[PDB]
Each structure stands twice: as C-alpha cells, then as structure tokens.
C-alpha cells in the first residue's frame, strides 16, 4: 500500500516501490516518460517533476543524451533513504536503527569537543535551556499547560499534535514523548552545528525523520527521558568544569545504557512503527 | 547568472538567488503565490512546483493554512546544500572545503577501525585496487587506453568526460585528476560501507558531488597525488598488520598534511572552480 499526500507524491513512491521490488530493476533503464505517464496516471509534467526529485534523492541518474537508468541505490542516494527503507522492509528496522544509535555515539565526542572548544557560551546556552525544558514539561500536569507556557510552543506544535487518540493517558503518552525528541533533536543537532562544523549538523538534519521515528517511541519510556536529562546535565557539567576528559566516559556510558534500553523496547515496538505519516 | 535546463529549474535557481540576495531574506515571509508570479514573471503552473522543489530541499516551509515562510538557512536542508553554496557563496568555498576535510580527517578514524576489524579482506581488495588503480593511472600514456582496459570503464565514464577539451595534453590532466579522485571517493565511501553502519558510507554519498567538484580541482596537483597514494598504502599496511594505535596518527597526520597542500591551492582556485555544472 502507499501513503501519500498528492497525485505526486503518490506517482513518486509508486515508482520508489517498483525499483525496490524489482519491477523497475537498479541497473535497468527507466521506461519511456510517454509510457510511464500511462502506467501511473500522472500527466507529463507532473511525472516530470517526480522524475527530477527521484534523481536528485538517488533513485534515478537522469543525463541529457542517455536515457533515464534506475541507480544502485545505497551507492548513491544519502542519508534520507534509511526512514524510506524502514517503511520498506520493517524487518530491517532494528538494524538500521541500531546505526543510527551507534553512529550519533561514535560522532557526538568530536562535533561536542569541538562545541564545547570553540562556542562555549552558546553550547551551555542550547543545554541549559534543553535542561529546564525537559523538566518544566514532565512536571507540568498536561502537555497541553506545558505548551501555553512555553516560548517553544509554536516550533514544538509544527510538527507535534495529537488530535486522533482520544484516549488522554495514551495521547499525553505521546505529546510527552514527541516533545521530549523535539528537544533531545535540538541538543544533538544544535550543538553540531556549534561545532563550527556545518557538516555535523546537516548529518542530523538529513538524519531527522529517522531521528524523529525513532525518539517518539523511545522517549515514551519514563525511565528513558530521565536517563536523558542526567546525561545533559553530565554534558553540561563537563563544558562548564572544562574537564575535557569526561566527555568520551560520559558519552560512552549513555550510549551503553540508552542501548540496554532500546534493547528491551525494541522487543515490543509498535505496529505502526514504521508507518510513513506524510 | 543562473544556468538552467528548464523553466522549473531556472525558477528554482532565480529564487534561490533572490532569497541568498536579501530579496526573499531567511526568517521572511514569502509573497503569495498569484503575487510572486507576476513579480517574478514565472506562471502560477512553473511557481507551484518551483516552490515544492524548494520546500522538500528546505528552502522554505510550506503548510496549508499559514503563509509559506523561507527558513532560516541550514535549518531543515540536508548535506546537499554544501554545494549550491559553493555556487552562492563562491568568496566563502574554503570554509566548506575545509568542513569537508575536517569532518573527513574525524570520522575516518572510526568507521576504518570498525571496517579493519570486521570486514578485513574486503577492506584490503578496496585498498589494494585503489592503490593499483592509481599507480597505473599517472604511470599511463593514454587515459583513453587506460579506461578501455579498466574494469571500471563505464563507471568512470560514466561522470567523468572531456569532450571540450580540444589540447589533449590539457584534456590528459583534467581526466587524470578527475580519476583519481574517483579511487579516491572509492576509498572512502567503501570503507565507510564496509564498517558495518551504512550511515558512514551514506555521509560521503550526500557530500559526493562537493566531493568530486573538490577532488576535480585538488587532484591536479601531482604533489597531492603522490601524497594520498602514499597514505592509502599506509591504510593498507594498517589493516594487514592489526596494529590498531597507528591508525589515528595516520590519518590525523594525513589531514594535517593534505590541509597544508589545500591551504596553497584555494589561494589559485581556477575560475571555474564554484560554477554551476548542470
């Protein structure tokens, strides 16, 4: 089945699902714009616009003379295609998710060391109020109350709502377990863009749909978000102390422990895990 | 000046322009789309999918009922944007290069770490044939003659031509830099996949055409030839020998070295060095 938004959109994964399941092979030449245009039901000049963005994300090499091929994908699309390929293959869920632990461990000592080194004050800044938010919105009675208080209420609520479970213990379950990504996300992103590095940064916004994934279902645990808000504290505390050598220990232990975790929640991830929401 | 091969894609690219020129400045609101059709002179059929285009690279934000608004830059866009920057930005190009350098010099210690120890002998057929390939590249007459007995013919070919170039000694050394760089992205990029986490083979696939337009330029240089080659047989030998501690002074030392070469030549950068190449 596919989910989508538009005739577009919709042409978009249609051919996105052929060249997965082989029925417009990596290797293989794209058929015809004519043909193809009939086969999926998009006029020409909407295929045209879905054909230039499958090129640009990877999926297709489109040059002037040749004719359209079909890529090997992973060889040469980035770091979008890991949520795509979830909604693919759910059983390869766990794997990939496990890179993306295992990845944001392994680089966060350098973009954080670099932070720490060369924006100082802006690092604890982007802590401290990482910190304190976190605090005021597990404290607060509802997220709703959290959310008319709070200055990030109108970056937290683009891409945060919950207007279908009805439900209020499940639906506070979740706009707690959103928001809590919402700023986990800017922690790690933000102070990779402090690194005076842009490409730590882009990483983790090529990264974010996967990231958001990901910690929408692992911050629904309690014991998860208060790991969390200890580990921020440690990393402010290695900044501000200047203890330079912490930082490798700190990082090392919360990826151990974050890691025993996921290993337990990822046992009973939900069903609609790997779902698509756009 | 924009170069372009459709009217979508001019549009894409005029406004992309108008918003790095402060005529559509980041934070700002973006005119509606029957205003910014005839301000600009684009039709409302061209402007709808331009501004689709710029919404999915994170140019701007895009949401049904509130007006669509151009963000703040790097807020949403992926590793992608580095090179459009070049273009935009061609008085700042060291500082992107020099992200690409650093970030390479950093990560490299720990996905060919990772690489060395799981996937060993594959890892060494990578190096061995890049090595190989390379000897064999700058010790050949003709490049020509060298691809048609190279099993990487279509490949190379497939991104790497010089149908301009009517001095065919200048046509040698444009298609020798260019093929090693090739190997050279080869090396990188499979060793990042062989590490196990495909999210380090992925980083180098978004930064891959900043990666070939640097290469291209830097790779022209026989001193930076000679000296990457010396450091892949190093890499090798690495490998081989198990000898784990040697790794990071390598590479770290490498950096330091080819940083030195690069900051000599961004202060020749050729004219076409940040040129849009579509």
Redesign the interface.
């Known amino acids: 089945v596919i989910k989508a938004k538009s005739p577009?959109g919709f042409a978009e994964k249609y051919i996105i699902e052929s060249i997965w399941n082989g029925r417009f092979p990596p290797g293989s030449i794209l058929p015809a714009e004519r043909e193809l245009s009939e086969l999926i039901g998009v006029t020409r000049?909407t295929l045209?616009?879905v054909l230039?963005?499958l090129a640009?994300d990877?999926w297709l090499?489109i040059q002037?003379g040749k004719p359209t091929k079909v890529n090997q994908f992973?060889?040469?699309?980035?770091?979008?295609?890991?949520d795509t390929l979830m909604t693919l293959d759910a059983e390869n869920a766990t794997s990939?998710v496990e890179?993306?632990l295992?990845?944001r461990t392994?680089?966060s000592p350098?973009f954080m060391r670099y932070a720490f080194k060369l924006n100082k004050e802006s690092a604890e800044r982007i802590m401290i109020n990482v910190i304190e938010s976190c605090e005021a919105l597990v404290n607060a009675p509802s997220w709703d109350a959290f959310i008319a208080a709070s200055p990030y209420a109108e970056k937290i609520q683009?891409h945060v709502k919950e207007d279908s479970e009805k439900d209020e213990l499940k639906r506070q379950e979740i706009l707690i377990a959103k928001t809590f990504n919402f700023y986990d996300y800017m922690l790690f992103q933000r102070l990779a863009?402090h690194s005076g590095?842009?490409?730590?940064?882009?990483?983790f916004?090529?990264?974010?749909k996967l990231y958001d994934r990901v910690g929408s279902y692992y911050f629904s645990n309690p014991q998860a978000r208060e790991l969390a808000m200890e580990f921020y504290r440690q990393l402010l505390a290695v900044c501000q102390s200047g203890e330079r050598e912490h930082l490798p220990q700190v990082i090392r232990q919360y990826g151990i422990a974050s890691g025993h975790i996921w290993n337990q929640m990822k046992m009973t991830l939900p069903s609609n895990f790997t779902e698509d929401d756009c």
């Open positions: 577009a000049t045209r616009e230039q963005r640009r990877g090499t002037h992973m060889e040469t699309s980035g770091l979008h295609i890991l990939i890179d993306l295992a990845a392994n680089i350098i683009q863009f590095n842009q490409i730590y940064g882009l990483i916004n090529g990264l974010k």
